[PDB]
Design a binder for this molecule. Structure first.
Ligand code: HMG
Ligand code: HMG
Lengths: 389, 389
């Protein structure tokens, strides 16, 4: 079998309390906490770009042996920093991976990480001793006082795909669904995305229903066959509406189980926000660590990308997977962050727009053990490398 | 066997004479004709963007049956018009391909179409009745009076990957090579690429030598084993220098053959210019149609992307491939174009920068049988479809 052998995520060291953001935006805190379903929003310091966040997510799950066996590094993002050079190239360099590897980016809104791991699996079919590194990295920025502001976030998720995966085996049952719609998009030159709020929810749910229906038909399966589902998470309130749209034909036993699985799956996302390509996979991590699913059980996954493309596929838990997760590290990552005021958040936000370096505001001295953007000279980004290196 | 079943290209209806461009830039025409090795430069009218060019390249090689079997549409480009929405989604819509397909973009400078077709092959390994559509589409724009201006071009190449390919079987011997270098890149916000002319030369050749050397070692092969080599073509002279850098250990019979093959491979490119991701594949079309290679013979291909990533792999000619090409149509495509003066070219160029529509200057009435960008309303691009639909 081939699948996810290792998985990890990274989010910036700052966050803004959603209740505080609500107060600053003149709305009832529960509108954000319950209405949208978010609790803490990741805030990006200038010294963390998609390259450094991606490197930080992958660094803790790649051994010296893995560096010799990785044949491809694929970066999924819709927050690129170059129109030509793939961020996968810089990350491959920062991680010290062997040279004879393919490095490139995949793009399609929040969907890109899915074809990356699926095609990584196809690539590995005839290469039992190789591995593939897939990294989802993004900064969901809508703008101060914008409609999408409350759903903002930033982070990266790294996955190592290989034979005899220690965590999840990817099954051969994926089915995608494409439909040309303008629910969310970002033309060249626009700093923030254009969005048709209401339309985005309809497009999202339709893609899910169409993808699921075809999958059920082709595989002769039903929701009762899954221990849990795992979806893309722009915000928990979204995934709940999508969930209820179909469980609406499932028996009571299945409904209770899938609803419970969902809460476990979006637990971590509630404290981060939308991280685009990485949302579904951050939710996968949350599900694997917060729930006690048994080996051999199957998870049903739905990946979405505005524009739009959806895909439903399944994966099976591998015997002993709990021993290959880093729940303590992940809980620590989230708890060790520092809360910043809305005012401070707005200042950070504006500085990020123009990559305005400030080593004191970004408290760079604290980042000795991680990768971070240190400066830009002659249009070339320079990165600080972990001191242990 | 799995490989290229159908292949075609599209370039805009205008071009500027390189001798004329030389006179306007105050340089000897031969500097361009022989020095760089280019004769005519493709010129982009505003009504041709990467989406319409891509659709035009694919439309003549997609049958109603293919539309039902295509499982993925992958667009390779470094000239994206949206930071989130993949151009593959619009092309999938324009071509009327069945809905249950993956659509996304791949990015890594001029390298992206290669992992696209290679992974398309891997995807098809267990899907005997499916096909994959790969489209390389780009606009190489350096700027008026810039160092790279003479190498400019625009166009798209479409390839249908399938089982029992009618033209070329892709062999299982690919090897890529990645090395972080800033020879060419384009930070977000930059209309044109930043380039280190001299460095780009060395980077291109080093990538080729490193990739070829590892390929030769892994396969136990030599240049004598190839009927011809096919490379990425930013400009003919480039590929000649790279070529001479290794043939420099080949016998005389091999040197004569590979040099002759190179001339056949860059024939079409001389009249178009650099089309980034599509250069290597436009050269492949040129080689297949201009040379009389025999079934069973093998071609060695080198793909390059600044940044940088290179890859060397081989493909074998299928019996009867000549009956599946479209040489007459291709000669017509190039011949039916209209020459524009340098002043007109500069006017087109400046208009393209701001997507300034002008139905008379772009002469849209002439484009009744092709796809073209007709307008942009509320940040959404609208396309004219062939009237035969
Ligand atoms: C998400 C919206 C539309 C929200 O927009 P909004 O106006 O800020 O909030 P709302 O008015 O839409 O509703 C908030 C909810 O809170 C409730 N509420 C009201 N007051 C209270 C109160 N006092 N206490 C408790 N609850 C309260 C209210 O009733 C409502 O519940 P609902 O209508 O859902 O049942 C907006 O912020 C937005 O446009 N979001 C960003 C876009 C987005 O996330 N798209 C949807 C998903 S599409 C997707 O996943 C693709 C994407 C986004 O990732 C892009 C890509 O793929 O790249
Ligand atoms: C290509 C350069 C460097 C040329 O720059 P230039 O200054 O315009 O011309 P040159 O000075 O470099 O030399 C022109 C040649 O003409 C000769 N010459 C001189 N006068 C005469 C005359 N009267 N009669 C005949 N010949 C004459 C002269 O001797 C020389 O021959 P060479 O040095 O090669 O032997 C520049 O235009 C440039 O920067 N090009 C764009 C970048 C590029 O194409 N890079 C090379 C490959 S990198 C690649 O393939 C990646 C890329 C570019 O596609 C990016 C991506 O991946 O996305």
């Amino acid at each position: 079998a081939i699948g996810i052998d290792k998985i990890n995520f990274y989010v910036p060291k700052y966050y803004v309390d959603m209740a505080k953001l609500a107060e600053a935006r003149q709305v009832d805190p529960n509108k954000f906490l319950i209405g949208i379903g978010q609790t803490e929003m990741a805030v990006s310091p200038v010294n963390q770009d998609i390259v450094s966040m991606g490197a930080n997510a992958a660094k803790d799950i790649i051994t010296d042996e893995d560096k010799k066996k990785i044949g491809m590094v694929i970066v999924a993002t819709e927050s690129a920093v170059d129109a030509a050079k793939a961020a996968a190239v810089q990350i491959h360099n920062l991680l010290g991976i062997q040279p004879f590897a393919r490095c490139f980016e995949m793009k399609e809104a929040c969907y890109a990480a899915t074809p990356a791991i699926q095609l990584a699996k196809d690539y590995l079919a005839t290469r039992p001793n190789e591995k593939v590194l897939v990294i989802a990295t993004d900064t969901a920025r809508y703008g101060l006082n914008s409609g999408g502001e409350p759903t903002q976030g930033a982070g990266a998720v790294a996955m190592v795909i290989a034979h005899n995966p220690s965590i999840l085996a990817l099954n051969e049952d994926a089915v995608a669904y494409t439909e040309d719609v303008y629910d969310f998009w970002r033309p060249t030159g626009h700093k923030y995305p254009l969005v048709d709020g209401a339309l985005s929810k309809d497009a999202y749910i339709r893609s899910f229903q169409q993808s699921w229906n075809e999958y059920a038909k082709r595989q002769g399966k039903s929701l009762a066959d899954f221990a849990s589902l795992c979806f893309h998470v722009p915000f928990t309130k979204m995934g709940k509406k999508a969930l209820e749209s179909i469980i609406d034909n499932a028996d009571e036993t299945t409904q209770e189980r899938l609803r419970s699985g969902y809460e476990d799956a979006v637990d971590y996302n509630r404290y981060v926000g939308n991280i685009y390509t990485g949302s579904l996979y951050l939710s996968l991590i949350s599900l694997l660590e917060n729930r006690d699913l048994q080996a051999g059980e199957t998870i049903g996954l739905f990946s979405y990308g505005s524009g739009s493309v959806g895909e439903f596929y399944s994966a099976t838990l591998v015997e002993g997977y709990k021993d290959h997760l880093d729940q303590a590290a992940h809980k620590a990552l989230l708890n060790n962050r520092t809360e910043v005021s809305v005012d401070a958040y707005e200042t950070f936000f504006k500085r990020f727009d123009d990559v305005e370096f400030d080593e004191e505001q970004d408290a760079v001295h604290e980042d000795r053990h991680i990768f971070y953007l240190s400066n830009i000279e002659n249009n070339v980004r320079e990165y600080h490398r972990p001191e242990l290196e």
